[PDB]
Write a protein that binds this DNA or RNA. Structure first.
Ligand SMILES: Nc1nc2c(ncn2[C@@H]2O[C@H](COP(=O)(O)OP(=O)(O)OP(=O)(O)O)[C@@H](O)[C@H]2O)c(=O)[nH]1
Ligand SMILES: [Mg+2]
Ligand SMILES: [Mg+2]
Ligand SMILES: [Mg+2]
Ligand SMILES: [Mg+2]
Ligand SMILES: [Mg+2]
Ligand SMILES: [Mg+2]
Ligand SMILES: [Mg+2]
Ligand SMILES: [Mg+2]
Ligand SMILES: [Mg+2]
Ligand SMILES: [Mg+2]
Ligand SMILES: [Mg+2]
Ligand SMILES: [Mg+2]
Ligand SMILES: [Mg+2]
Ligand SMILES: [Mg+2]
Ligand SMILES: [Mg+2]
Ligand SMILES: [Mg+2]
Ligand SMILES: [Mg+2]
Ligand SMILES: [Mg+2]
Ligand SMILES: [Mg+2]
Ligand SMILES: [Mg+2]
Ligand SMILES: [Mg+2]
Ligand SMILES: [Mg+2]
Ligand SMILES: [Mg+2]
Ligand SMILES: [Mg+2]
Ligand SMILES: [Mg+2]
Ligand SMILES: [Mg+2]
Ligand SMILES: [Mg+2]
Ligand SMILES: [Mg+2]
Ligand SMILES: [Mg+2]
Ligand SMILES: [Mg+2]
Lengths: 68, 511
RNA sequence: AGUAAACUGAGAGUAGAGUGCUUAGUUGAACAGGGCCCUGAAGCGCGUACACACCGCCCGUCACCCUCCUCAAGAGGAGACAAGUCGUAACAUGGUAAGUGUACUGGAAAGUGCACUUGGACGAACC
RNA sequence: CCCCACUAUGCUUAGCCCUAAACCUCAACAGUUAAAUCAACAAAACUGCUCGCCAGAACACUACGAGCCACAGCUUAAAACUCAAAGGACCUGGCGGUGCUUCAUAUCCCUCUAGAGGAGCCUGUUCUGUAAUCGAUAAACCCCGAUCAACCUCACCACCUCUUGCUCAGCCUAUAUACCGCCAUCUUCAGCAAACCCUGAUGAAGGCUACAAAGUAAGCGCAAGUACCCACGUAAAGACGUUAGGUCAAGGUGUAGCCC
RNA sequence: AAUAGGUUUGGUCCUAGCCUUUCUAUUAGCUCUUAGUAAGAUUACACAUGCAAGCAUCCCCGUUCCAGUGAGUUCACCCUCUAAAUCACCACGAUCAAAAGGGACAAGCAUCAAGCACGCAGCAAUGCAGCUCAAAACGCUUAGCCUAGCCACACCCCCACGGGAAACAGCAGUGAUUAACCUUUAGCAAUAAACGAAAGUUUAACUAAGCUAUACUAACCCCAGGGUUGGUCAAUUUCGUGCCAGCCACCGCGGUCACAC
């Protein structure tokens, strides 16, 4: 993230149904997303990540819920 | 979470039990006459009308001799699960042997696993077959075994009547009875997507009577039965136990071999939801482990698969999973599905630079044009081994060329000279060619008492103050290397060689 | 100013231990006049893009990654990321006042010529 | 940047180019000073009418399109990606290789005296070394904690030994960037501030002129008194705060940590 | 945008953007007891199957309607003229309403500024050289609209002789596609339409049902989940974490005492 925040935000590049490649943040602690997996991505920018304006919807398609 | 799962009913009461037809599955090796025997029983010919004369699907047919449900399992090694599914659902197994092979042994093992009676059919007629089967725990009545052996000739239609008589006798001995009333219990034999009838499942009813409008659940899927048809496509108003049926109306496509249970009403969904949740939990546990394992720390062929039926897709995926040449080339399965090649498959292949493989599925002109525009390669096959060969060819294409080194000549150094040319001291090795010849174009390597010192091409080949391209055997030649760091001794050796690129074939074997 | 300098003695602490520290005494000077040029202080102002406050802020060139745009896919541009490197261009009269147009020149901020602006000052009776 | 020489150029004629902080950054015309004058600064506040222009910053006096005698040009002029700001004017403070004036009294300069930096030694520190402490470490550390280490001191290292242990345990273990306690420093200053009151249109803020014009001020500090030989000098004193200044190793103590 | 609120800065004032608070709709996550009513593919992409137009003494009439979709798009409204249709038959007319004529009629772009024959006179021959336009002509892109309903389309070639080719934008349903996903129900009993002189017949119009928390209404002896808790903005105890994991609509939090994970 940009200053003054510091972290390793879990992001993934995905090709959308519109044919456009975009970077989507993966919220929640821990994820098992892999190549060729299908996700549902919604809006809502990640504030500390420049250029990231999408977010993976946890609990839909291959992206499971956050494991307690 | 509360358990809302729909479970199989307890074993039917003896009073409620009613005699039913038998389910007989024909199993055996490739080209052992299973399809021909089934054609003779069915009074119709379909072995001739096939792609390559190979049974690639498990089909159930209600034959009227009495009535029996014959299941034609494929004999190929690819569709092992298919055969297993038949063994799981059958009551009697007709093991067809041409006058014992690997797939026959596998089918025998499946029948033993399922604890089902076996009737041997010696097609193309025998004693040698029974003696061999003695090793595989298939003992004939001539050898004191329960298994009945019938020599038959399917092509000429000989002795088939006695085979049917033995099947009927074994069915009568088994006394197959089931409850023809109450909630329906059955098993999926196949599932596919018809462009007109939606998601369709070929199933076999095990208990209860299925009727239009019955709400069924199978795995993560559920349906409100919309059309029940037979093999000929005609609608049937009821589906008694031990009756094949094509059921339409599935909201999602069930996996082959999944049990089907009838429920009270659609708000079924809950049951499906519960099952989904269970699966998620299982995956979640695995996910948790993997995630924890991470948190404590802190030549790529991509293939799309589109098949006509889920069973064929499963067989192809099992074949793919038997890939063991990941070191030379990595085979990634981007996406597998059921049905004709579609826009999503083309987009996925384009995204990952993959290749679409279509087993018994089509691709319209629009789809083909889109794939050509996007550089996607669609490969449609109708035979499983053809698809396997094509996949092997693609994998070999992905493999890098293999360089073959052929020795051309050999020369031994005699003297070392220092020539002053262009203000530069060039070390020159006086070499005598012992065997073969040395060529300027061909590469060279330096050998020091068996050790390999240098590998490359000469910067200058010169003999008797004249440049000669090829020096014959016994000809002296001064050799100069491009590498100045190389030291030339009195006893060094030089081996010339020609390097030719050769096509490399994949080490993976489908068997 | 009994100050600097030189000489002598005593005490603290130690069983003993300092060329050290504290302290008493003795002999005992020179310059002390000019200056706001240097460095600071005060009074009245002036300027300020700094405010953990000039050890501030800040500009441009020379690598990687990311997004977008214009493109004969090689490339250019913008923004973000923000490093390291070369200078210190701007903010105080920023140490050559700053800037506009334009022309030429330069590793880079930028320099210079010409005209213009105050979004600078000229200390605000005489001296 | 400073000095020297010279060219394009500045001049004339004939065409072009058509840009300026082309700004008096304040449109033309007609009218008012009435009040409800008026964010701030600037060059007071306005009214009627009309035209031109403006609509977050940056991209951007840019790209593309178009027009032009212009061909590295001028005019018109976007969009995408990005940010929660950008901006205008102020208040207070700091700072200025900032102006004027007055000073510095061991003192800023020229000056006066004795030294240090050169030598040997004593002693401290850095660096190297060792199995072998720690802390201070610009002014405001460096014969410093020590008015003091051969054993002890000692908290260091190596080996050996003990486990309710001198203690109703213990720890010189971490944190002085949690502190008390004692201090350095500006200070070789003179200001800090309760409670009120007034000005700023009731903004941050500010509050003095003695022929006085909004300040009054308890209290702390300076000063006065006091110690030594005076009233002089030297001591002592020296506030609020500054440097997250020094000390967890004077002792105590928060938090965290070890308990064969 | 309002009764407004947070947010520029060391601080204040002004301008300004962004966001919050409110009300809907769609989708997604988690969750969900019942009843009534209303509403209900993302797609002018392709469609399996079943039905959706008959009636009637033969001729005729209807199948040009209803039903559907929103691709295209200033054919919708007012006036003049007057076709077809109803009033059995003329109505020497009324109602209704085509074509034709006049007028009015969406949004963005001027970096779309010129269009290039877009006019007039004459009976005609032919003559004049004009006509529209910065008060937006011409052009490009977007869009069903002004909702008792109206306009347009009916697989495409605007049309449909013809060609491409064999058509669900009728109902139920399906494939593909999308974040988007209603039953392959019944009856003509009510109304409407078609036919008949009529008893009547037919109708996937419609009626009565089916599925769905999309909405509203109402209830339940038992049956409640979702989000949030630093400020705006109602509401946190203790542990773990230690600028990491993570959170945030904006300001921002997290570096060993976290009201923000
Ligand atoms: N000589 C002989 N040949 C026979 C007889 N029955 C069948 N065949 C032949 O054997 C072949 C059997 O192969 P298939 O018809 O494909 O039957 P299958 O054993 O199920 O083979 P798969 O479908 O590939 O598993 C047929 O092509 C016949 O021509 C027989 O009774 N005698
Ligand atoms: Mg066969
Ligand atoms: Mg400078
Ligand atoms: Mg300057
Ligand atoms: Mg200049
Ligand atoms: Mg120059
Ligand atoms: Mg000069
Ligand atoms: Mg002159
Ligand atoms: Mg001028
Ligand atoms: Mg310009
Ligand atoms: Mg330009
Ligand atoms: Mg251009
Ligand atoms: Mg010395
Ligand atoms: Mg030391
Ligand atoms: Mg230290
Ligand atoms: Mg010692
Ligand atoms: Mg210790
Ligand atoms: Mg401190
Ligand atoms: Mg003192
Ligand atoms: Mg005093
Ligand atoms: Mg400190
Ligand atoms: Mg320290
Ligand atoms: Mg549409
Ligand atoms: Mg343009
Ligand atoms: Mg449209
Ligand atoms: Mg169609
Ligand atoms: Mg048409
Ligand atoms: Mg339909
Ligand atoms: Mg579908
Ligand atoms: Mg919906
Ligand atoms: Mg009638």
């Amino acid at each position: 993230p940009k200053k003054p925040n510091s972290a390793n935000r879990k992001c993934c590049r995905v090709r959308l149904s519109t044919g456009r490649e975009a970077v989507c943040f993966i919220p929640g602690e821990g994820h098992t997303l892999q190549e060729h997996q299908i996700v549902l991505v919604e809006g809502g920018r990640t504030q500390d990540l420049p250029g990231v304006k999408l977010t993976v919807v946890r609990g839909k398609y291959d992206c499971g819920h956050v494991q307690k | 979470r509360k358990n809302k799962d729909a479970v199989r009913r307890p074993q039917a009461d003896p009073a409620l039990l009613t005699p039913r037809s038998p389910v007989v599955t024909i199993m055996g090796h490739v080209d052992h006459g299973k399809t021909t025997l089934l054609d003779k029983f069915r009074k119709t010919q379909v072995a001739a009308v096939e792609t390559g004369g190979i049974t690639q699907h498990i089909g159930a047919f209600l034959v009227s001799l009495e009535k029996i449900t014959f299941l034609d399992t494929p004999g190929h090694a690819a569709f092992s699960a298919m055969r297993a599914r038949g063994a799981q659902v059958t009551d009697i197994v007709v093991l067809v042997v041409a006058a014992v092979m690997k797939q026959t042994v596998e089918s025998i093992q499946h029948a033993k696993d399922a604890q089902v009676p076996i009737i041997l059919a010696v097609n193309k007629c025998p004693e040698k077959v029974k003696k061999e089967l003695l090793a595989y725990d298939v003992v004939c009545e001539d050898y004191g075994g329960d298994v009945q052996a019938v020599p038959v000739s399917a092509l000429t239609g000989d002795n088939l009547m006695a085979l049917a008589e033995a099947t009927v006798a074994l069915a009568e001995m088994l006394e197959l009875k089931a409850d023809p009333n109450g909630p329906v219990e059955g098993t999926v034999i196949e599932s596919f997507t018809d462009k007109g009838r939606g998601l369709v499942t070929t199933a076999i009813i095990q208990r209860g009577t299925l009727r239009k409008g019955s709400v069924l659940v199978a795995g993560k899927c559920w349906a409100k039965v919309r059309l029940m048809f037979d093999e000929n496509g005609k609608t049937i108003d009821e589906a008694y136990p031990s009756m094949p049926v094509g059921i339409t109306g599935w909201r999602d496509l069930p996996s082959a071999g999944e049990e089907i249970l009838e429920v009270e009403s659609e708000p079924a969904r809950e049951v499906v939801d519960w099952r989904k949740y269970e699966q998620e939990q299982e995956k979640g546990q695995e996910d948790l482990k993997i995630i924890e394992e991470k948190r404590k720390e802190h030549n790529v062929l991509s293939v799309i698969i589109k098949g006509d039926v889920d069973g064929s897709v499963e067989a192809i995926l099992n074949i793919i999973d038997t890939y063991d040449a990941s070191h030379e080339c990595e085979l990634e399965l981007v996406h597998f599905g059921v049905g004709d090649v579609s826009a999503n498959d083309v987009n996925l292949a384009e995204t990952f630079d993959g290749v679409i493989y279509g087993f018994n599925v089509n691709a319209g002109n629009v789809i083909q044009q889109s794939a050509a525009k996007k550089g996607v390669k669609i490969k449609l096959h109708k035979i499983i081994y053809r698809l396997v060969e094509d996949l092997q060819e693609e994998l070999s294409s992905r493999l890098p060329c293999a360089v073959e080194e052929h020795p051309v000549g050999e020369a031994s150094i005699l003297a070392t000279f220092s020539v002053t040319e262009g203000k530069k001291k060039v070390p020159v090795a006086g070499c005598r060619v012992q065997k073969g010849q040395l060529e300027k174009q061909k590469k060279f390597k330096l050998t020091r008492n068996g050790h390999v010192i240098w590998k490359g091409s000469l910067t200058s080949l010169k003999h008797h103050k004249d440049d000669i391209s090829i020096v014959k055997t016994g000809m002296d030649c001064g050799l100069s290397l491009d590498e100045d760091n190389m030291e030339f001794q009195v006893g060094d050796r030089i081996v010339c060689y020609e390097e030719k690129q050769i096509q490399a074939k994949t080490s993976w074997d489908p068997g």
